[PDB]
Amino acid sequence: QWALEDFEIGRPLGKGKFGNVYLAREKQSKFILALKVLFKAQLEKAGVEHQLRREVEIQSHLRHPNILRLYGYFHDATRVYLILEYAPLGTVYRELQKLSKFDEQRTATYITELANALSYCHSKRVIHRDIKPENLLLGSAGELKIADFGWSVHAPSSCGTLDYLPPEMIEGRMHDEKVDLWSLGVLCYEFLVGKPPFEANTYQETYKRISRVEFTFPDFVTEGARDLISRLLKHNPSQRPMLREVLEHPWITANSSKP
Ligand SMILES: Nc1ncnc2c1ncn2[C@@H]1O[C@H](COP(=O)(O)OP(=O)(O)OP(=O)(O)O)[C@@H](O)[C@H]1O
Ligand SMILES: O=C(O)c1cc(-c2cccc(Br)c2)nc2c(F)cccc12
Ligand SMILES: [Mg+2]
């Protein structure tokens, strides 16, 4: 249905693993979108196709103001193209580099929009498994938008930086919707402290710290926050709350700026 000669390409937006994201314009409508270019050669030598076809299946069907739209796909000689909703205010990764750390207002607000989009995802039995500030894009009004559904899959189920992965996942063990709640705790901590609660210098140390759940809150972290992070960073996936509790938590309700 789509062809490259329908788009006026532009400036690069971010580098992926198997190709770059570029700013683009649909000639006939003047529509601004972001093109995610992937290379068949690269995806081949890794065996990601399935996941790339899964990413597209999952993302094309989901509709939420806190989830990035996938408007379609196409492919050339060696490139695979994904037509996405352009996020004009970049990523949460860049914003955290600038600000160093976020205030309770900003953090609660992001945690609220994150939980929101997650409920939707989980209600269709879809687990993201790759919730990272690198994959959390910002829309024109500063709204959070989950992106990159490469690692998403239908719940339950059996690579890169370990940080945002729950112990069940890093240990091959079977996993469900509760995986995304561990990520939610890791993100909250990182939003307030400026670093994830298990960061190390080696893949090796990170694994040990995650498996043991070895984390220590610095001075400036309030009780209200300390409580929710600890509530979400439980080794037992069933001992973790449901997004509903997260959304209604005193510290969230008190600090989140609603519409
Ligand atoms: N719609 C968009 N608008 C603005 N920037 C984007 C958009 N999509 C991606 N980017 C930028 O491009 C980079 C790549 O994003 P993405 O995570 O989709 O690629 P990826 O990590 O290779 O995906 P995958 O996890 O499937 O390999 C990100 O750092 C992001 O900042
Ligand atoms: O040329 C190919 O056979 C090829 C196609 C695709 C593809 C086609 C439509 C939608 C999507 Br999502 C992907 N992907 C490929 C790939 F990932 C590696 C090698 C070849 C292809
Ligand atoms: Mg990514």
Residue numbers in the entry: 127 to 284, 290 to 390
Copy text from the publication.
To provide structural insight into how AurkinA binding might hinder formation of the AURKA-TPX2 complex, we determined the crystal structures of the AURKA catalytic domain in isolation or when liganded to AurkinA. We noted that whilst the structure for AA30, like that for AurkinA could be determined in complex with AURKA bound either to Mg2+-ATP or JNJ-7706621 in the active site, the AA29 compound could only be soaked into AURKA complexed with JNJ-7706621. Interestingly, depending on the concentration of reducing agent in buffer, the AURKA kinase domain crystallised either in space group P6122 or in P41212. In contrast, the binding of AurkinA, and indeed any of our compounds increased the overall B-factors of the crystal structures. Importantly, in all structures where a small molecule is bound in the Y-pocket, the electron density for the AURKA activation loop remained largely undefined. More detailed analysis of the liganded crystal structures revealed that binding of AurkinA and its analogues caused significant local alterations to AURKA structure, as well as changes at sites distant from the Y-pocket. Based on our structural data, we hypothesised that the allosteric, Y-pocket-binding inhibitors would not affect the Km for ATP, as no significant changes in residues involved in ATP binding directly were observed upon AurkinA binding and ATP was always present in the active site. The F165-F144 backbone hydrogen bond was significantly shortened (3.2 Å to 2.8 Å) and the K143-Q168 hydrogen bond present in the ‘active’ apo structure was broken in the presence of the Y-pocket binders, potentially impairing the ADP removal from the ATP-site.
